[PDB]
Subunit: 268 residues, 4 copies
């Protein structure tokens, strides 16, 4: 009766109703999870977005670069879920890389300050969140972050791909920490999804050549995917995150599950 029946799951990374985290949250609630959400910066916006979720969920502010937000997280969530209750699940669906960065836009021209910001928010924050939240997670718990496969370089994604490589590496370390809590840590490597930001990129936000490359990447995905890939549909990835949040992948950690249509297994 619900994949996630009775689980308390924190879901970060909702910014629009096309956010992967929005779908993760929706599916998680459809599957009986009780949610706490974290949002960055535009919390009035995020509350209005998340009102459309099948169930209400407390929305907490988390700027993953903050420190004080991080320090007060755990307390703020236990307050939201009630004293003596702990998280069963944590979803990191946070990513950012300054344009600079990420297209466009010579790889070599991204200032380290921008790269570092990107890696902070996209990779290091996975350890941050796990640090903040593991003290309030139950044995049998699950931390899941959003990834894409960075094992091979690719056009446009540039330093974001590096940030994913760092994230994957971080996840493997987080798994070592999380294990002491009976908690799993895994990533979901998604195929490309037409999120608002992503649509804006294919639309040229970051230069025509970046857009053209992403579109090429999207098409080759689908072709390569033995079961196809629908970049307009985040549900299969939400479902995969929910599988990791459930008790049905109980021996998997420090790992990456590829919700990418099988594209990464193919080549051509």
């Amino acid at each position: 009766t619900g994949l996630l029946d009775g689980k308390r799951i924190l879901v970060s990374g909702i910014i629009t109703d096309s956010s992967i985290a929005f779908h993760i949250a929706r599916v998680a609630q459809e599957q009986g999870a009780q949610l706490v959400l974290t949002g960055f910066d535009r919390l009035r916006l995020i509350q209005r977005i998340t009102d459309r979720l099948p169930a209400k969920a407390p929305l907490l502010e988390l700027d993953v670069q903050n420190e004080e937000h991080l320090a007060s997280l755990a307390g703020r969530v236990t307050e939201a879920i009630g004293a003596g209750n702990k998280l069963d699940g944590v979803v990191h669906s946070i990513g950012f890389m300054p344009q600079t960065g990420m297209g466009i836009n010579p790889f070599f021209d991204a200032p380290y300050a921008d790269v570092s910001k990107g890696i902070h928010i996209s990779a290091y924050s996975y350890a941050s969140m796990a640090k903040a939240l593991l003290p309030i997670m139950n044995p049998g718990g699950s931390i899941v972050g959003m990834d894409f496969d960075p094992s091979r370089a690719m056009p446009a994604y540039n330093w974001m791909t590096v940030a994913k490589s760092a994230l994957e590496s971080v996840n493997r370390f987080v798994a070592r920490e999380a294990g002491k809590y009976g908690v799993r840590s895994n990533l979901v490597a998604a195929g490309p999804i037409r999120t608002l930001a992503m649509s804006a990129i294919v639309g040229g936000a970051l230069g025509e050549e970046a857009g053209a490359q992403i579109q090429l990447l999207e098409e080759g995905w689908d072709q390569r995917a033995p079961i196809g890939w629908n970049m307009k549909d985040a549900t299969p990835v939400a479902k995969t995150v929910c599988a990791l949040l459930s008790d049905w992948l109980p021996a998997t950690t420090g790992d990456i599950i590829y919700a990418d249509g099988g594209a990464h297994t193919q080549l051509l």
Copy 2:
């Protein structure tokens, strides 16, 4: 109401009540799947074993090297599940390598005839089974085979590790075929499990040095696994197979899920 509520799933590879497939079957039935089982050679034995499953399941003979069994499979299962019904799930949990082979017992001394037999039953049969069964599988279906991680060589498992490397490669091709049917094909790379055969090996069936090496491998697994590994417990791997059989990994194919405690992500 059951991860696998209403799914018809064929499960090969039951030979004892400590078989990984036995646990896969049990968990699958606990989760509402309707099963057809295939067994090799000792079908009276296998029926008696499988009587202990929470639900009855037709037991069909399948010797994966046979050809005629393969040719008549599909027909024999549609007969068992009823005309107009198709499989949603297929579990390959079949492995064999002649001792020779697999310890012991110099890698170089395994005759190709023995290796070939091993690869036939352990790798090629995954394509065989998919060939036989995909014509009687539903869109949204799932084929799952049992794997262990062969990306690095290891003591004792010798040609069986090669057979797993071939199996993984076969799986990626099977995924291409299965996709045309809306069907996923994936492997579960398990940590070591104290199956009867495996206990017999650690007990010295294949030489003292093979046994000692497997025991060393088992211990290092557990240590490496951020969440530990219990070689006496096949349930976490059955559960993982069930996750792949469910609709909750819908964008994963040609892939390997590691139900190994996270050990392969670690090193030390």
Copy 3:
């Protein structure tokens, strides 16, 4: 004065003057290696081909499926190189998969007998050759086999890709044996090369669709390769084999060096 100055190196796999092994041999001789060659089946042809090598080299018959050839190899080479001399280098450049097999031509329709033959010649023979030859190899020696990257499935190459997956796995085991002799074992994963057989395939020998797929694969290689890929030029791969045969990769074994233009590192 010659990368391979003074090394005695056995090179299998010459069948035409466009054979990768022909280029390996030529470059090896240019670099001061003394060669023994092995050839399969058409030894009059192979002698005539190899007369074009910058230096003479004894040509020995080796049918890698034979057993007696294998058993008498070592003796036949020590005879060719002189009593008390041993090999420093061994090149396996042997591959075969029955059409059936390898295009075309449904993956599922390849009979196991054909697959097994393919794996025998393409994967198992690497262990065979190492078994035969390690007793007559010097410490500091190097065994190198020809590979292509099978980590992702691909059109057309079908069971040959599986045979490469098995070969890579075999190589890792061969490395364990070879190490006891102070000998390295590595593979070179080449990009596609317009060998006679390969040109015949792109020309349609194995069906129009196989040809079209290989041509697509060849083009995408080159595009993906950060330094490009020239399928008409086997020299960069011969050179790479020679690097593995030299003393300049002394801490590398059980490994794969990708002489593929960097294509496998890229994606798009």
Copy 4:
């Protein structure tokens, strides 16, 4: 006559005579390369160290976090090698992670400022150096960085492992840039080497438990390495860097060569 006969090669990362870069430089000079060296911070020390090299080499200051050093590099090297001469080779042998960081010393307790510094010097600087130097590199050129395998998490190395994951990812992007110059970019993943810093760690500089873990890691390396691993001997890795700097790996880029005794191919 010298693997690197006539090549002009810049070698960063010499700080002591046990530095991997010192051995890279020595071997490179033994092989006929003309060197320019870069050193960080303690240039009087570094000059005194490098006086022991078989040949003199101009020593240029490079603090890879500086910007002005980076901007003036290229000009300073062309000055050292003479107008109208360009580099054939670049060696990045630069790594740093604040203790914090790297033992000890909870993974979660490393402040992002420290991690970011580590990633700056250890990963991002590979792109920095390539940016600075590719404009003064010849076609057929080679950039090589020092890596260790971060694909699996490990004790003690903590954020340095993450920095290596980022470095590997950066290398793949650098390969895309370098290719436009006819230049290869590759990494050498070394086994552990008893550098001064490393000896200080195993000696307990970073806590007893970090030391014990590194020693365990070192022992398991050697055991796993089919040809053994000698942590006191940096020569096999210098040689491997020299192989990448030569013309003998001409079709390899965006790649990693494992000079680790074959340990990463093994498991147990």
